[PDB]
Structures are given as structure tokens and as C-alpha cells.
Write a protein that binds this DNA or RNA. Structure first.
Length: 843
DNA sequence: GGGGGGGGGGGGTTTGTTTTTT
DNA sequence: GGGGGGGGGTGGG
């Protein structure tokens, strides 16, 4: 029976274990190095009236009158008498309005104008929070233009985002900022003084930072009775915020859009006459209802439509969008309907590429007229400003886009919208401690957001791709981001702001996270040694929290600063927290992967390719402006991302100087870059940063094609993502890898992986233990990472590791620049000598 | 692994967007 | 999963 399978399994496992035993890297330093280490171990106001006069003088400006001429047409002006008045009376108000009414650029101006005209115009300072950088810039610029002025330069409006700030004047004025700016402001002055009107906008998205800021405002309102907070949701479940804040008054601002008509799947199939080509938990409960009502619904539909439509709708796939239907719908729209610009929404790249190929396959979609512009976050400069250009008559511009286009693209020309009802979400599995990524049906808010892009300047049409039963059973809203994502950086943010009791505060959030996730995050932080035994923010924790990155990246930055390899480590840290400078165009994907491996050279690493690309870009910038563009074109780089990385490096160096680890704000000073030309030291520092993420690789010698299998301690058998450099590699000097991002899309995937030497794991690793498994005095760092070495060397390695740990604790607790020209604590020098030299195991 | 059979979705190369003082 | 086939056995019994 099943005994033969067990016999096969045992016979294979014995051989596999016997083959893996004789493939462990040997650890041995030298004859003289042992003597040196032994020796070292043995040695161990008129302004108020001025504002009114300026307003009166500007009231006669021709440009100001012209701006008022358009501003009068906005619906929100009709509520100006009310919107201000209640804001004057109540403390917290909720403003709900549909798309079309410019509440963002009107509500703030109403309060400012009322305060200025009333006389007490020097006692207000409105701070409005936006969820996107480009949105904040555009809103601030437009508001500045609306008052016949310019943003910043001491005017009455301005904005502030990361590394870009045009500040307005202190008294009066408006400041548009992202949520992170306010959350960082909360550290200096906890009560947020000198702010008279805090405005939270687009709060219905329910992102991570807005929820925290809203809770802080709610529990801060007790100590600041004179502070006014104004929330702007957008219809639908706008009563939830009012109930949460204590039944505050609400105002419903009417919208204004051109009429649009919605067609569902049955209407589309009936209209275009399309014949098909010949061939958890809660998610279950809804589906059950969709099953129970499935037959009866059809039993009605057969009387409202033809037989063929019912047959096509019944035999319909519910797990993937069919691109043949979209390709036929676009054909029908092109041939019959009038001029416009089709905009189709797709889940991801796998469908965008297929739809583009299907469209370009047909003969008519190849002439001068039709142009197809895919939109994605991994395409060059979102295909430039081609989408924003006005289409000459007789072209029928077609855009195939993921969700990028439903939030901030603003083509402002489309009239036909096609909505394949599928979106991609990134959940987080607490039991398996791995974040997943799946495709789920769009929510009602998502459907409304996609439909609202059609009618803005001209009446249009919206074509949804699901039947009425699925439309009626759609989720009201997407899951709040507070209930997905690890809560690790947030946990340190709670303690650095002294908000409360790390776990007590998280219970006051709207839709509080599950207790298991909080406990897991606290345990992970305790293991990382950032948090004390009783959650007291150990000295490493303060530096980790004050840095604007994840704790793992923060430790890498600190260790790179300690070991005098600041520049490449800072570049890697900057590129590990904000994208990467590589963009893959739609047509050419093999070429990009072939020219990225050339950048990788022979480092057998993924993080080192970013360093090489940045070094090449910096060397090319000095030559000239045209050379920079040529270099970015040849290697498929992005200039904007590289500039942002440069600014982030500057900010990190400034903070490190502020703490005291380094002696200059410049991240390329020659004093703190001694070990900057060695890749081994950089790899050791990276392994010190991202230690717990270590994967073993096994090369199955023979068996037709030589293949490498990657294993992890907990997550079974992972596989290297094809985008990584080491996807096709088969010759590894060391059989160990470290990674940063690991995701479960369909199978567990590592997105960036780099090999590490045994000495990089022995020192910056777990608890070293010495054993004897009938082979030698094998030394293990975590009981599963085993190396071969004699006992006399393993004992020295363990003692040196203990001394290094003590020295690093002392150095991190009290930072110092450290001088390499003296002999006070030379553990670091000996460790650098060991890592730089020796090694070369090639096993 | 392959195309036994449609046990289970354990595997079968890929790729929602977005954020941080002085 | 059983007990197709001996595809792997770090997929499970």
C-alpha cells in the first residue's frame, strides 16, 4: 500500500542528507591570525488692519475678478454662508460631497477670507493634509493662482512635502502638507500649538498615517478647546466618521458632473452581439448568497433578454477578466460611437500586455489614427506627457491602465470608460507571517471612483463587466490598510510620540487591528532588541524610531555608519525604502533584464546593482547634460527616482550628523568612507541589517539540467523572482542568501537576494553554538546554519563575537565618530581584517 | 510531474499604489 | 490524496 511510498521517501531523504552533509563551507582563518586573535583576547496689531487693506486693494484687481468669475460657478460657493457659520459654532464638523465640487480648494479659502474680513485675520493658520505629494503640489499651486499670487515667497499660501517646501507667511496663510509632515511635527510640540484650523482631506481612503493622525487629533482635542478640526469625506459611509467623533454635524455639498450611463455585462452582450470563442471566511459567506440566488436570477433574466445573451452570461468565467470581450467592445465603440478617448482598467501587467498584443494583432489597430498608451508604475515616466496632450480629431486615443489612472492621472479628456471589475490587493497573513497578493472584486467605492472619471467636460459612457447580481453583492468598502500591513514602524511611532501604552492606543483606533498582529509585532520588536523587556524603548530603539525608515533598514544605516562605509550603504537603504531606478518598457523586457545583469557585473548580488547604477549615473552627470540622458536611456534607468534617492541620501547623512555618528552632513566625506571600495564589507553590513531573513540554497548536481532549490527556516520552499539578478545563476561561491521582500502571489517569491560569506553570518547573526555531528566541531549560529571548523577556531570565533557584541552595545548607546589611528578597542579592526581577507571558501 | 483525474489548488517562472521637521 | 507512477520525498501519509 502506502509503505512503498514511505520506503522511497526514506531512501531519497537519506541520500539527500548524506549529500548535504558533505557540502558545508569550511571555516578556518590562518596560523598567524590565530596568534593575533589570542593576543588581542588576552589583552581584551497693525497687521490685522494691513490684511484687510490688502484684501480691499486686491478686490479691484482684474485677474482677481476674472478668477471670481469662474469660482462663482462652483457648487460649494452656494453653501458659503453655511459652511463657515457651523465651523464657527461647532468644534468638529464633517463635510461630505460627491465628485465635482471643489471643496478642497474652497473650504479653506472660505475660513481664511471670513477671518480676514472679520478683522481678526492674524489669529488663524490653516493646515490642510493631502494624501499625495503631486496632489498637494497641484492644489497649492492652483489656490495660489486663484488669489492672483504665487505659492510661497511670503504669500498667503504654500505647501510642504518631503525635501520640497515653499512656506507661506506665518500669520494667516494656508499650508498644504502630507500626513507625514504633521506626524513628524507632533514630536517637537505634542499639543500642535500655533495651528488654528486643522483640515484632514480624502480621509475615506483609510490609509495608515491618516488613521493615526485622526486618533491623535481626537484624543488631543481635550487639551485644546480652541482648536478646530474639519474632515472632508466623500459620501457613501460618511456617517461612520460622524458617529466615531461624537455625532458631529454634517454638511452634504451637492456635486456637479455631466450625466453618464452605466452598462452592465448583460447590456453590453446584448448591444454588441458578442459570441464567445470556442474553447477567506467572509468571502465564503457572500459567495454562498451569490450561489443561492444564482438560478432564480437567471429564471428572471430569460424573460428580459434573448436566449443567446443568457447563454453567454451563464457560461461566464468568474476568476479572470476575458480580454476578448474588451477587444470586441473597443471594436464596436470605434466603429459605431462618436469621437472620444477610451480608458480601460485592468488588474495588472499580465492582462495589460495580453490586451495590448491582442489589439495590435488586428489589422485596423495599426494605422496612424489609433494610438495605444499603456499606463503602469514600471513604465518610463508614466509614458511622458503623451496622455495629457490634446488629441487631434480622428485618432481615438486608447489608454490601458491599472489603478494608477483612477487616483492621480487626470487625463480630463476620456468619455468612454471600460471597467473590468477586478483589482489587486496586498493582504497580510499573521499565522504564516507572510504578506500575500491576490485579485479581488472591486468595491462600490472603487466602482464609483472609476465611473466618475468619464463625465467631466462632456457626457460619456461607463461599461462595467459584471452582472447585476455581482453588482448588488459588492463590498461596501475595501479593507482599511490598518488591518493589512505589518505594524512594526507604527509600533515605534506610538512610543516615540509618547501617545500611550503601545497596545492601549491601538484599541482606540477606528477598526482596531487584531490582537494577534499586535502581539506578533511586539514580539518581533523585542527579538530585534529595539524594545525593552517592558516596552521602554531601549537606546537603539530611539535611533530606530527617529529615522524615517523601517527598523531593519535603520539598523543597516547605523551599522554602515559605524564601519565607515556610509555611501553605498546609504544608497542601498534609500533604494530599499522607495522603489528602484529601473523601469521596464512594455515592448522590451528581455533587453532590460539582459542589460541589468551587465550592471550587476560579478557581485552575484541584487542590492549592489543599485550601487553600480548610481555610481555610473553620478560619473555620467559630470560629463554633461546630454550624456546623462544617454546613460539613462541605455540602461533603462529613471532620472527622477535617482534624484529622489540622492535627496534621501542627503537627508540620512544630515540626521546621522545630528545624532553624532559622523562628522559632516556630506554623505561622501573621505574620513567616513575608508571601507567603501570593498564589496565584502558592504555585504557584511547588509547581512548585519537584514539578519533574520536568511535562505539556504542547494544545487542539485546532475539531474539533467542543474537547478538550485531555495529553502527557508519557516516558509517551506521559496523561489527566486524572475526579476532578480540571481534568477538564472547556477554558480554560487557560498550557499547562503539574504533577502528583504518576500511575497506570496502564487508561490513564495524573493524579490531581491544577495549571497553572504560565512563570516558575515557568524558575527552578525544568532547565538553561536558548538557541536560535533560525527564530522568535525561544526559551528552553528542558529542550530540550522551549520559550518565546518575545528574547535580551537570556533572557540576563538565565539569569544570574538561576544566581545564585538559588548563593544557594539557600548558604541551604539553613546555614539562617537571613532578614530582608526589609535589602539583602544581594536575588535572592529580585527573583524574587518578577517572579513576583508581570508574567506574565499568557494564552497 | 504530466496532461492519472477534475484528492487540492502542493507545484506549474513574473509585475496593484503610496507615504516621513527643526 | 491513494496506492496513477515511481515526478519528489523540503508535498503529504
Amino acid at each position: 500500500g502506502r509503505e512503498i511510498g514511505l520506503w522511497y521517501a526514506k531512501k531519497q531523504g537519506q541520500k539527500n542528507k548524506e549529500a548535504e552533509r558533505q557540502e558545508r563551507a569550511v571555516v578556518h582563518m590562518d596560523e598567524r591570525r590565530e596568534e593575533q586573535i589570542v593576543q588581542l583576547l588576552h589583552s581584551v496689531a497693525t497687521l490685522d488692519q494691513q490684511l484687510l487693506e490688502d484684501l480691499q486693494k486686491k478686490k479691484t484687481d482684474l485677474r482677481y475678478i476674472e478668477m471670481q468669475r469662474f469660482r462663482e460657478k462652483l457648487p460649494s460657493y452656494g453653501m458659503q454662508k453655511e459652511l463657515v457659520n457651523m465651523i464657527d459654532n461647532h468644534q468638529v464638523t464633517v463635510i461630505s460631497g460627491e465628485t465635482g465640487c471643489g471643496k478642497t480648494t474652497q473650504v479653506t479659502q472660505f475660513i481664511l477670507d471670513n477671518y480676514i474680513e472679520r478683522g481678526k485675520g492674524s489669529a488663524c493658520r490653516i493646515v490642510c493634509t493631502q494624501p499625495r505629494r503631486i496632489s498637494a503640489i497641484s492644489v497649492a499651486e492652483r489656490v495660489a493662482a486663484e488669489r492672483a499670487e504665487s505659492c510661497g515667497n511670503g504669500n498667503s499660501t504654500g505647501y510642504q512635502i518631503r525635501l520640497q517646501s515653499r512656506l507661506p507667511r506665518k500669520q494667516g496663510s494656508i499650508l498644504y502638507c502630507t500626513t507625514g509632515i504633521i506626524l513628524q511635527w507632533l514630536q517637537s510640540d505634542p499639543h500642535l500649538s500655533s495651528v488654528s484650523h486643522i483640515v484632514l482631506d480624502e480621509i475615506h481612503e483609510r490609509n495608515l498615517q491618516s488613521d493615526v493622525l485622526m486618533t491623535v487629533v481626537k484624543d488631543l482635542l481635550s487639551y485644546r478647546p480652541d482648536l478646530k478640526v474639519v474632515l472632508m469625506s466623500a459620501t457613501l459611509n460618511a456617517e461612520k466618521f460622524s458617529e466615531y467623533f461624537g455625532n458631529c454635524p454634517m454638511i452634504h455639498i451637492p456635486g456637479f458632473t455631466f450625466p453618464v450611463v452605466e452598462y452592465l455585462l448583460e447590456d453590453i452582450i446584448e448591444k454588441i452581439r458578442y459570441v464567445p470563442e470556442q474553447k477567506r471566511q467572509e468571502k465564503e459567506e457572500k459567495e454562498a448568497i451569490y450561489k443561492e440566488r444564482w438560478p432564480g436570477y437567471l429564471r428572471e433574466l430569460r424573460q428580459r433578454y434573448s436566449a443567446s445573451t443568457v447563454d453567454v452570461v451563464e457560461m461566464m468565467d468568474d476568476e479572470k477578466v476575458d480580454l476578448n470581450l474588451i477587444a470586441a467592445l473597443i471594436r464596436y465603440i470605434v466603429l459605431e460611437e462618436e469621437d472620444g478617448a477610451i480608458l480601460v482598467f485592468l488588474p495588472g501587467w499580465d492582462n495589460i500586455s495580453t490586451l495590448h498584443d491582442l489589439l495590435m494583432s488586428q489589422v485596423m489597430f495599426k494605422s496612424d489614427k489609433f494610438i495605444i498608451i499603456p499606463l503602469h508604475s514600471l513604465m518610463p515616466t508614466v509614458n511622458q506627457t503623451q496622455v495629457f496632450k490634446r488629441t487631434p480629431p480622428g485618432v481615438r486615443k486608447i489608454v490601458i491602465a491599472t489603478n494608477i489612472a483612477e487616483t492621480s492621472i487626470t487625463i480630463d479628456d476620456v468619455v468612454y470608460v471600460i471597467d473590468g471589475g477586478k483589482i489587486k490587493e496586498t493582504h497580510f497573513d499573521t499565522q504564516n507571517n507572510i504578506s500575500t497578493m491576490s485579485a479581488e472584486w472591486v468595491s462600490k467605492a472603487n466602482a464609483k471612483q472609476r465611473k466618475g472619471r468619464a463625465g467631466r467636460v462632456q457626457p460619456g459612457h461607463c461599461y462595467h463587466l459584471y452582472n447585476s447580481l455581482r453588482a448588488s453583492l459588492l463590498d461596501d468598502y475595501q479593507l482599511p490598510e490598518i488591518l493589512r500591513t505589518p505594524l512594526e514602524e507604527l509600533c515605534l511611532q506610538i512610543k516615540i510620540l509618547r501617545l500611550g501604552g503601545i497596545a492601549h492606543f491601538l484599541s482606540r483606533l477606528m477598526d482596531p487591528p487584531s490582537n494577534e498582529a499586535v502581539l506578533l509585532s511586539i514580539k518581533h520588536l523585542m527579538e530585534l532588541n529595539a524594545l525593552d523587556k517592558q516596552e521602554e524603548l531601549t537606546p537603539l530603539g530611539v535611533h530606530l524610531a527617529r529615522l524615517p525608515v523601517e527598523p531593519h533598514i535603520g539598523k543597516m544605516i547605523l551599522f554602515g555608519a559605524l564601519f565607515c562605509c556610509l555611501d553605498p550603504v546609504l544608497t542601498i537603504a534609500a533604494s530599499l525604502s522607495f522603489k528602484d531606478p529601473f523601469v521596464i518598457p512594455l515592448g522590451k523586457e528581455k533587453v532590460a533584464d539582459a542589460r541589468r545583469k551587465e550592471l550587476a557585473k560579478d557581485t552575484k548580488s541584487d542590492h549592489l546593482t543599485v550601487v553600480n547604477a548610481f555610481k555610473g549615473w553620478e560619473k555620467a552627470k559630470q560629463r554633461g547634460f546630454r550624456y546623462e540622458k544617454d546613460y539613462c536611456w541605455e540602461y533603462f534607468l529613471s532620472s527622477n527616482t535617482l534624484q529622489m534617492l540622492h535627496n534621501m541620501k542627503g537627508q540620512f547623512a544630515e540626521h546621522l550628523l545630528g545624532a553624532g555618528f559622523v562628522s559632516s552632513r556630506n554623505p561622501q566625506d573621505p574620513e567616513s568612507n575608508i571601507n567603501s571600495d570593498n564589496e565584502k564589507i558592504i555585504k557584511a553590513v547588509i547581512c548585519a541589517g537584514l539578519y533574520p531573513k536568511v535562505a539556504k540554497i542547494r544545487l542539485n548536481l546532475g539531474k539533467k539540467r542543474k537547478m538550485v532549490k531555495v529553502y527557508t527556516k519557516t516558509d517551506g520552499v521559496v523561489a527566486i523572482h524572475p526579476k532578480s539578478v540571481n534568477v538564472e545563476q547556477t554558480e554560487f561561491n557560498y550557499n547562503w542568501l539574504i533577502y528583504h521582500l518576500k511575497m506570496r502571489t502564487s508561490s513564495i517569491y524573493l524579490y531581491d537576494c544577495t549571497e553572504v560569506s560565512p563570516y558575515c553570518l557568524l558575527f552578525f547573526g544568532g547565538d553561536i553554538s558548538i557541536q560535533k555531528d560525527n564530522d568535525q566541531e561544526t559551528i552553528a549560529v542558529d542550530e540550522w546554519i551549520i559550518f565546518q571548523s575545528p574547535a580551537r577556531i570556533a572557540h576563538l570565533v565565539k569569544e570574538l563575537r561576544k566581545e564585538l557584541d559588548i563593544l557594539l552595545q557600548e558604541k551604539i548607546e553613546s555614539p562617537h565618530p571613532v578614530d582608526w589611528k589609535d589602539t583602544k578597542s581594536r575588535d572592529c579592526a580585527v573583524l574587518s581584517a578577517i572579513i576583508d581577507l581570508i574567506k574565499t571558501q568557494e564552497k
